[PDB]
Design a protein around this motif. Structure first.
Motif, PDB file in Angstrom:
ATOM      1  N   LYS A   1      38.358 -30.546 -35.268  1.00 42.72           N
ATOM      2  CA  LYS A   1      37.682 -29.940 -34.130  1.00 42.72           C
ATOM      3  C   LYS A   1      36.796 -28.787 -34.569  1.00 42.72           C
ATOM      4  O   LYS A   1      35.639 -28.692 -34.150  1.00 42.72           O
ATOM      5  CB  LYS A   1      38.702 -29.449 -33.114  1.00 42.72           C
ATOM      6  N   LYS A   2      37.317 -27.902 -35.415  1.00 41.20           N
ATOM      7  CA  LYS A   2      36.580 -26.689 -35.751  1.00 41.20           C
ATOM      8  C   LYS A   2      35.294 -27.012 -36.499  1.00 41.20           C
ATOM      9  O   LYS A   2      34.224 -26.483 -36.173  1.00 41.20           O
ATOM     10  CB  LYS A   2      37.459 -25.754 -36.576  1.00 41.20           C
TER      11      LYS A   2
ATOM     12  N   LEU B   1      32.748 -28.389 -34.072  1.00 36.20           N
ATOM     13  CA  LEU B   1      32.144 -27.394 -33.200  1.00 36.20           C
ATOM     14  C   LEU B   1      31.288 -26.402 -33.960  1.00 36.20           C
ATOM     15  O   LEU B   1      30.501 -25.686 -33.338  1.00 36.20           O
ATOM     16  CB  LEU B   1      33.221 -26.646 -32.426  1.00 36.20           C
TER      17      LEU B   1
ATOM     18  N   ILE C   1      24.992 -28.372 -29.031  1.00 34.72           N
ATOM     19  CA  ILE C   1      25.767 -27.842 -27.914  1.00 34.72           C
ATOM     20  C   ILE C   1      24.917 -26.888 -27.092  1.00 34.72           C
ATOM     21  O   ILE C   1      24.941 -26.922 -25.857  1.00 34.72           O
ATOM     22  CB  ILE C   1      27.046 -27.151 -28.411  1.00 34.72           C
TER      23      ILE C   1
ATOM     24  N   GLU D   1      34.555 -20.414 -26.520  1.00 35.12           N
ATOM     25  CA  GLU D   1      34.889 -21.798 -26.193  1.00 35.12           C
ATOM     26  C   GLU D   1      35.657 -21.962 -24.891  1.00 35.12           C
ATOM     27  O   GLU D   1      36.798 -22.432 -24.898  1.00 35.12           O
ATOM     28  CB  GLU D   1      35.692 -22.444 -27.323  1.00 35.12           C
TER      29      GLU D   1
ATOM     30  N   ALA E   1      36.795 -23.996 -21.779  1.00 38.63           N
ATOM     31  CA  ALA E   1      37.247 -25.374 -21.917  1.00 38.63           C
ATOM     32  C   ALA E   1      36.129 -26.384 -21.688  1.00 38.63           C
ATOM     33  O   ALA E   1      36.259 -27.550 -22.071  1.00 38.63           O
ATOM     34  CB  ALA E   1      38.394 -25.649 -20.946  1.00 38.63           C
TER      35      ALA E   1
ATOM     36  N   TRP F   1      34.315 -28.420 -24.820  1.00 41.67           N
ATOM     37  CA  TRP F   1      34.909 -29.527 -25.564  1.00 41.67           C
ATOM     38  C   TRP F   1      34.412 -30.871 -25.052  1.00 41.67           C
ATOM     39  O   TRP F   1      34.089 -31.764 -25.845  1.00 41.67           O
ATOM     40  CB  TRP F   1      36.430 -29.449 -25.493  1.00 41.67           C
ATOM     41  N   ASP F   2      34.342 -31.042 -23.733  1.00 34.78           N
ATOM     42  CA  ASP F   2      33.777 -32.275 -23.203  1.00 34.78           C
ATOM     43  C   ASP F   2      32.310 -32.415 -23.583  1.00 34.78           C
ATOM     44  O   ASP F   2      31.853 -33.520 -23.888  1.00 34.78           O
ATOM     45  CB  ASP F   2      33.947 -32.327 -21.689  1.00 34.78           C
TER      46      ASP F   2
ATOM     47  N   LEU G   1      30.979 -31.287 -26.339  1.00 32.97           N
ATOM     48  CA  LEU G   1      30.982 -31.685 -27.739  1.00 32.97           C
ATOM     49  C   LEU G   1      31.255 -33.169 -27.873  1.00 32.97           C
ATOM     50  O   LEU G   1      30.547 -33.873 -28.600  1.00 32.97           O
ATOM     51  CB  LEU G   1      32.024 -30.887 -28.512  1.00 32.97           C
ATOM     52  N   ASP G   2      32.267 -33.671 -27.171  1.00 30.14           N
ATOM     53  CA  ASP G   2      32.508 -35.107 -27.211  1.00 30.14           C
ATOM     54  C   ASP G   2      31.285 -35.872 -26.742  1.00 30.14           C
ATOM     55  O   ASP G   2      30.969 -36.935 -27.285  1.00 30.14           O
ATOM     56  CB  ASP G   2      33.711 -35.480 -26.354  1.00 30.14           C
TER      57      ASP G   2
END
Length: 105
Positions: free
Chosen positions: A41-42, A45, A52, A75, A77, A80-81, A83-84
Motif C-alpha cells: 500500500k505505502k 500511494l 492521485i 490519507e 479514507a 484509498w478508493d 488509489l484503487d
DNA sequence: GGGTATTCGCCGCGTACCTCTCCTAGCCCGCAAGTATCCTATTCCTTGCAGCGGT
C-alpha cells in the motif's frame, strides 16, 4: 572527470538515476495470475501521487494542490478508493539488480 | 640501412543497494585576563623663613 566508471559518460550520461521509483524485498504469494504482482500500500500511494492529485482535483474534493497534498499526507479514507481507481490498468516495471538478458526487466 | 629481438610504458579489469566515520597545517597578531609594582595617603621627629608684640 570523463574517463573511468566515475566519469560522466558511464556514470551520469548513459545510465541516470530516475524519479518515480521504489525498492523492496520480494516474497512468493502463489495465488496470483501470471500477469500481475503484488504491491505494498505505502509504495503504491507514494509512487502514483501525481495521479492521485489529478483525480482529487477532477472530482472537486480539493480546490488546489496544497489541500490535495494535505489530504494525501494524512490519507483520509477517501484516498484509498481513489488509489484503487487509478491502478485499474496501469502497468509497472519490475527489475532486478544484475539484469543480464532481455527478460530481466 | 635493415630485419630482427627485447624492453618500456600505457590500457583494462561486474551490477545494484544498505550502514558507519572523516574532510589541511601551521604561523601570527589582536586580544582578554591576571598580576607585581608604583604612587597615594595617614602618624612621629627636626629645620628655615616670615610675621609680630614690644620696647
Amino acid at each position: 572527470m570523463i574517463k573511468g566508471k566515475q566519469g560522466r559518460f558511464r556514470q551520469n550520461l548513459l545510465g541516470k538515476r530516475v524519479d518515480y521509483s521504489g525498492r523492496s524485498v520480494i516474497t512468493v504469494g502463489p495465488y496470483l495470475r501470471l500477469h500481475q504482482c503484488g504491491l505494498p500500500k505505502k509504495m503504491a500511494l507514494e509512487l502514483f501521487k501525481p495521479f492521485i492529485y489529478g483525480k482529487l482535483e477532477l472530482r472537486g474534493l480539493a480546490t488546489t494542490i496544497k489541500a490535495a497534498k494535505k489530504m494525501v499526507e494524512r490519507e483520509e479514507a477517501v484516498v484509498w478508493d481513489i488509489l484503487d481507481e487509478v491502478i485499474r490498468e496501469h502497468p509497472v516495471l519490475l527489475n532486478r539488480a544484475p539484469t543480464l538478458h532481455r527478460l530481466g526487466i
